[PDB]
């Protein structure tokens, strides 16, 4: 989605300094789209990092718990 | 039309002669005789009206009355701001089906003191309800694969209740597919007493229109527009001998998809503009002396959907306009006046007012003077989009007009000059990326009209000159035509109804969109002829033919975009 | 009978009683119709009032009470109100009514539903447009405003009904019907379309939203004779139940064919014969199957308008191996009727 | 209509049909009244017989049948008998009746209950004295034995009813009501008191044993105009339900205010306006809260006595945050009526 919005901004970049064209509307609009999709990406990154943390913790939890099972057995 | 009744002047019926500002009315008869297939074609030929369109029917079009911007003409549907401009904040009639039009009252001149916002160029009250009973099955085949089929009937239920219904299908090519319009209309009007009356009215239409869109590989082609609209009006009229009361409520809903057939109407790439418009009006009038005094309120609510109008989220703009109008003919004098104050949920209040005087120096020749102040509210885009600016002030327009109307040996003529000093125009700035309130424009023009009978012949000739300029840069507002000549020769002979509509549209100034930077270029001024015949086969069946743009002229209104030339329409109607 | 006809207003109480019985092999689970005593009495009132010469208003209501039930907790089983509506008839423009009434498609399906007891199986109740439902607004024109005699048309809007069961629920719907009667001959065509509710879509059987019904009917009635042939097709409209799975829903597609031939005698007699068939298609897991396929052979003796007796033998041609647990047994019914 | 008037005996069958619909935003859970089709038909019979010159006996019964229901298991839902009682009217001393009838307090509450569809919400049914209940014995005096014209009084005893739900139960009760009509103006005052059953006390809401209701009404009706204002206060009498808690019971204290203003026209028209409010106090855990708070704006066209149409728009002023899950949405209703 971010690559998309930033392609739409390359698209309408032409009209960035053309205040009296159709495209120069869609340009700021793509601005909005890109900045949003970017904030979104940042949020997905935070959430993914968190999930990777939890996942690594679990991966160690297994090593430890199955060493414990080996000792108790 | 001279010396017939109009309502647009102060919302109530009055002989159009008594409206001091220059006025024109088109009738269903008048339109049928022109075999007009679009509202833009009806307006394109009224004086001071200069229309541009990106080609055939339904194509994006913009009207310039007396040289003003498209967003400076107030378009009314039965008297309420045309809902299709709502999102744009600009009238565009290429998409409004012509079949609902029954009467056009069109008064050029400031009218904010009666109708509020965005009434600078004039008022077009398109009345859709007329008092001709009976039933009419009608059909029409034309070029650009034009087809039209239309069943309509209005009938009395009692003596006080009239029910009117019509359905219509219409499709045209002219772009690769063009404009497809389907309309259904129902209305019932009751007469509670001699003076009490009420009416409900619901009508909807679907409009599928195809257009050329900027292509970029791997990016959707938003080249198809699906518009679904419905409206529901309900009113209550007391028409007494001295006091008249109008209570009117309307609710319009519209959904405007632009999409790529391949991607789909609801695909995320599609743009959806949903818009709900509510209006409540109260108008009162009391006959005082040789005249009357009127006072109303008009309120409107406009709600939008996220995305609607290229704005992130959906907005709610509310506007209430209180107004007062006086009118009194003293001796050979006539003094009309109006004041208004519109309080918009966007910009607080803003006042507006116009006043016209009509002295009849000679019996059948009089001098009308008139001044008006009119505003225009900043529109959805320039308020809430990223370019928008919520602290924008309305665009102001000072308008002065002087006119001499008179009847000379069977000719009714009007020579009038008008000035329009639009100020505080809203302009976008390159060096800041925001909508500012800077521009100005000095419009000066003359209107010379004359209609006259010569035996069986009826001539309606008129010349228009307009010099719209930027008041700051002194450069002429581009894409306007220096001067137009509109001349229609009507002469039915041996029951054959004939009509030769002529129009010379002067030199526009449009930008070229082939090379960048876009260079302004002069458009040639050309003449366009249209021929219309109508024969009555039966006292029911009437077959009419039309050759539009007889000489196949190579005119353009948007530089680059071609507009159809020679085009024919055969049609038949069965009135019983 | 007309009980009150005064003050330019007239009331017609109409009611009847029917001592009925169904016979069939076995307990009657597999019988076409059923088995046992099916006596029932219906009561109803019709009312009119000419407000003006050109405008009159009418209201009608009907209820059905079953006698087969016991006096315990099951007394009310099968007891219901069939019709309850009102409306006004203008002189020529037409007439508009609202309430609980037959759907336009019933107008087409009326030709076949002339049997004494059985018949009109396709015209299920509480179904979109084929049977009597609540929440309909109907407009009707007779002879096209008096322009063309014998040609009349009707239009009907159906308010959405969100009930507990998909069988009894519906949504926004529309329909129309046209009927031209000339010199005894008759032709009709009706179409109805509506949207299925979430409960209907959620059903295991059935798929899609647009529930569509339509039908075409032809007939000739004269000389103590009545011939009729109605062909109707529907999508996602007909209800269907699977005993093997004990699961219900709607039919993705259905074709229905009805044929009737009845003769009448001067001495209060009217023998009748009727063929019927309904085949569902695109059924979920059962492909295409036949819901009903039977012959009729019956008769009715009319002692008078108020007294009659009748019999009907239904030759159910459905096979036992049918893939929906449908009753593959014949059936018969014998009835006696009093009506005022 | 009068169907039998012979042998000093007269029978008046009265029945009507109503095609009705309720609209509101959303499904209608939060709407004041509801949403959808509310068509219903009511049937009833009244009968009189002059046993002697000074003594006549009367019997009246009414039932309501709902058409909104389907033909399945929910056919009987909402079907009931509203009124079923008998009694005798002496010449002057008065009249005494017994059965299932409106409670004396309803006599006071009649002034506000003039609306087309909504209205009289405070006069709930199966409540102590405000609405129609079963097990009442009432005596009435007209013009105080014919002594003073326009001043009439009634007294009512209420036998205890031990039902399954506290909502429908009561105990021993007594009540009285007086109404003086003078020159078009009307005044009324009613009071009722009874004992709550154990089931009622066991309910989570409500406290105390003496369930008390009383009301005062004023009006002016003439010249096609009708003004009315009823103010009523009750203790442990009004029912209340909490969606948040999904628990019901009674209100320790309640004040209710009703105001009506209706005009009538010669050409079968009758515009109406109504204000309403009800505030409960000493609620267990909820302090004081508003149960209903709305305006009415509606109208009714009377084609004739037997035919009418009407509309009502209810501006519910209750807020969503109300601590009882009350509907904070507006509503509208549109109805058409035939009646004989």
GROMACS .gro file of C-alpha atoms in nm, chain B residues 182-344:
model
  163
  255UNK     CA    1  -3.300   0.615  -1.680
  256UNK     CA    2  -3.555   0.830  -1.497
  257UNK     CA    3  -3.873   0.770  -1.298
  258UNK     CA    4  -4.093   1.051  -1.165
  259UNK     CA    5  -4.407   1.057  -0.952
  260UNK     CA    6  -4.590   1.356  -0.807
  261UNK     CA    7  -4.931   1.413  -0.648
  262UNK     CA    8  -5.079   1.759  -0.590
  263UNK     CA    9  -5.393   1.817  -0.382
  264UNK     CA   10  -5.612   2.126  -0.334
  265UNK     CA   11  -5.735   2.115   0.025
  266UNK     CA   12  -5.941   2.430  -0.034
  267UNK     CA   13  -5.956   2.711  -0.288
  268UNK     CA   14  -5.629   2.835  -0.135
  269UNK     CA   15  -5.485   2.543   0.064
  270UNK     CA   16  -5.289   2.294  -0.145
  271UNK     CA   17  -5.016   2.039  -0.088
  272UNK     CA   18  -4.794   1.809  -0.285
  273UNK     CA   19  -4.564   1.510  -0.250
  274UNK     CA   20  -4.311   1.428  -0.518
  275UNK     CA   21  -4.047   1.158  -0.558
  276UNK     CA   22  -3.818   1.099  -0.852
  277UNK     CA   23  -3.497   0.910  -0.920
  278UNK     CA   24  -3.252   0.852  -1.201
  279UNK     CA   25  -2.956   0.629  -1.286
  280UNK     CA   26  -2.680   0.768  -1.512
  281UNK     CA   27  -2.400   0.548  -1.646
  282UNK     CA   28  -2.151   0.764  -1.839
  283UNK     CA   29  -1.819   0.680  -2.004
  284UNK     CA   30  -1.535   0.928  -2.051
  285UNK     CA   31  -1.167   0.943  -2.141
  286UNK     CA   32  -0.937   0.920  -1.839
  287UNK     CA   33  -0.564   0.971  -1.798
  288UNK     CA   34  -0.399   0.633  -1.852
  289UNK     CA   35  -0.105   0.503  -1.653
  290UNK     CA   36   0.000   0.136  -1.675
  291UNK     CA   37  -0.051  -0.058  -1.356
  292UNK     CA   38  -0.292   0.208  -1.229
  293UNK     CA   39  -0.671   0.188  -1.262
  294UNK     CA   40  -0.846   0.380  -1.539
  295UNK     CA   41  -1.122   0.568  -1.361
  296UNK     CA   42  -1.313   0.614  -1.686
  297UNK     CA   43  -1.669   0.513  -1.588
  298UNK     CA   44  -1.911   0.715  -1.373
  299UNK     CA   45  -2.226   0.569  -1.217
  300UNK     CA   46  -2.463   0.823  -1.062
  301UNK     CA   47  -2.771   0.721  -0.863
  302UNK     CA   48  -2.991   1.005  -0.740
  303UNK     CA   49  -3.334   1.034  -0.585
  304UNK     CA   50  -3.527   1.333  -0.454
  305UNK     CA   51  -3.835   1.373  -0.236
  306UNK     CA   52  -4.014   1.708  -0.219
  307UNK     CA   53  -4.318   1.785  -0.004
  308UNK     CA   54  -4.491   2.122   0.011
  309UNK     CA   55  -4.790   2.316   0.139
  310UNK     CA   56  -4.919   2.634  -0.024
  311UNK     CA   57  -5.177   2.882   0.103
  312UNK     CA   58  -5.274   3.106  -0.190
  313UNK     CA   59  -5.509   3.366  -0.046
  314UNK     CA   60  -5.632   3.696  -0.183
  315UNK     CA   61  -5.380   3.912   0.005
  316UNK     CA   62  -5.139   3.671   0.177
  317UNK     CA   63  -4.949   3.381   0.022
  318UNK     CA   64  -4.754   3.121   0.220
  319UNK     CA   65  -4.509   2.858   0.093
  320UNK     CA   66  -4.381   2.578   0.317
  321UNK     CA   67  -4.146   2.355   0.116
  322UNK     CA   68  -3.922   2.066   0.224
  323UNK     CA   69  -3.688   1.861   0.005
  324UNK     CA   70  -3.452   1.568   0.058
  325UNK     CA   71  -3.208   1.467  -0.217
  326UNK     CA   72  -2.973   1.167  -0.195
  327UNK     CA   73  -2.696   1.107  -0.448
  328UNK     CA   74  -2.425   0.844  -0.492
  329UNK     CA   75  -2.151   0.919  -0.747
  330UNK     CA   76  -1.908   0.637  -0.830
  331UNK     CA   77  -1.608   0.683  -1.058
  332UNK     CA   78  -1.431   0.358  -1.134
  333UNK     CA   79  -1.257   0.136  -1.388
  334UNK     CA   80  -1.503  -0.128  -1.524
  335UNK     CA   81  -1.217  -0.375  -1.488
  336UNK     CA   82  -1.160  -0.284  -1.123
  337UNK     CA   83  -1.527  -0.245  -1.030
  338UNK     CA   84  -1.759   0.022  -0.894
  339UNK     CA   85  -1.688  -0.070  -0.529
  340UNK     CA   86  -1.319  -0.163  -0.565
  341UNK     CA   87  -1.090   0.038  -0.338
  342UNK     CA   88  -0.961   0.223  -0.644
  343UNK     CA   89  -1.313   0.353  -0.705
  344UNK     CA   90  -1.405   0.701  -0.581
  345UNK     CA   91  -1.744   0.727  -0.410
  346UNK     CA   92  -1.908   1.067  -0.355
  347UNK     CA   93  -2.217   1.025  -0.135
  348UNK     CA   94  -2.411   1.345  -0.069
  349UNK     CA   95  -2.733   1.413   0.123
  350UNK     CA   96  -2.907   1.749   0.081
  351UNK     CA   97  -3.194   1.874   0.297
  352UNK     CA   98  -3.379   2.202   0.243
  353UNK     CA   99  -3.659   2.374   0.435
  354UNK     CA  100  -3.801   2.701   0.302
  355UNK     CA  101  -4.074   2.933   0.431
  356UNK     CA  102  -4.189   3.223   0.214
  357UNK     CA  103  -4.465   3.476   0.286
  358UNK     CA  104  -4.604   3.755   0.069
  359UNK     CA  105  -4.859   4.030   0.135
  360UNK     CA  106  -5.006   4.242  -0.145
  361UNK     CA  107  -4.928   4.603  -0.051
  362UNK     CA  108  -5.035   4.888  -0.278
  363UNK     CA  109  -4.951   4.827  -0.642
  364UNK     CA  110  -4.721   4.547  -0.541
  365UNK     CA  111  -4.630   4.319  -0.253
  366UNK     CA  112  -4.386   4.257   0.030
  367UNK     CA  113  -4.227   3.916   0.078
  368UNK     CA  114  -4.014   3.768   0.354
  369UNK     CA  115  -3.878   3.416   0.384
  370UNK     CA  116  -3.617   3.191   0.541
  371UNK     CA  117  -3.435   2.915   0.354
  372UNK     CA  118  -3.226   2.652   0.530
  373UNK     CA  119  -3.011   2.376   0.385
  374UNK     CA  120  -2.804   2.089   0.522
  375UNK     CA  121  -2.532   1.920   0.313
  376UNK     CA  122  -2.377   1.598   0.447
  377UNK     CA  123  -2.091   1.420   0.270
  378UNK     CA  124  -1.916   1.079   0.293
  379UNK     CA  125  -1.540   1.023   0.351
  380UNK     CA  126  -1.382   1.049   0.008
  381UNK     CA  127  -1.671   1.255  -0.125
  382UNK     CA  128  -1.538   1.551  -0.321
  383UNK     CA  129  -1.171   1.450  -0.295
  384UNK     CA  130  -1.184   1.524   0.079
  385UNK     CA  131  -1.056   1.282   0.342
  386UNK     CA  132  -1.373   1.261   0.555
  387UNK     CA  133  -1.736   1.358   0.506
  388UNK     CA  134  -1.853   1.703   0.608
  389UNK     CA  135  -2.173   1.869   0.727
  390UNK     CA  136  -2.235   2.227   0.613
  391UNK     CA  137  -2.552   2.405   0.728
  392UNK     CA  138  -2.675   2.738   0.591
  393UNK     CA  139  -2.974   2.956   0.683
  394UNK     CA  140  -3.065   3.256   0.470
  395UNK     CA  141  -3.315   3.513   0.595
  396UNK     CA  142  -3.444   3.750   0.329
  397UNK     CA  143  -3.690   4.031   0.262
  398UNK     CA  144  -3.818   4.165  -0.071
  399UNK     CA  145  -4.033   4.466  -0.153
  400UNK     CA  146  -4.200   4.566  -0.480
  401UNK     CA  147  -4.421   4.863  -0.561
  402UNK     CA  148  -4.522   5.023  -0.890
  403UNK     CA  149  -4.592   5.392  -0.823
  404UNK     CA  150  -4.732   5.574  -1.124
  405UNK     CA  151  -4.500   5.490  -1.412
  406UNK     CA  152  -4.228   5.395  -1.162
  407UNK     CA  153  -4.148   5.052  -1.021
  408UNK     CA  154  -3.924   4.990  -0.719
  409UNK     CA  155  -3.811   4.637  -0.633
  410UNK     CA  156  -3.570   4.560  -0.352
  411UNK     CA  157  -3.427   4.269  -0.158
  412UNK     CA  158  -3.198   4.210   0.138
  413UNK     CA  159  -3.053   3.883   0.264
  414UNK     CA  160  -2.823   3.741   0.527
  415UNK     CA  161  -2.691   3.386   0.496
  416UNK     CA  162  -2.538   3.227   0.806
  417UNK     CA  163  -2.332   2.928   0.694
   0.00000   0.00000   0.00000
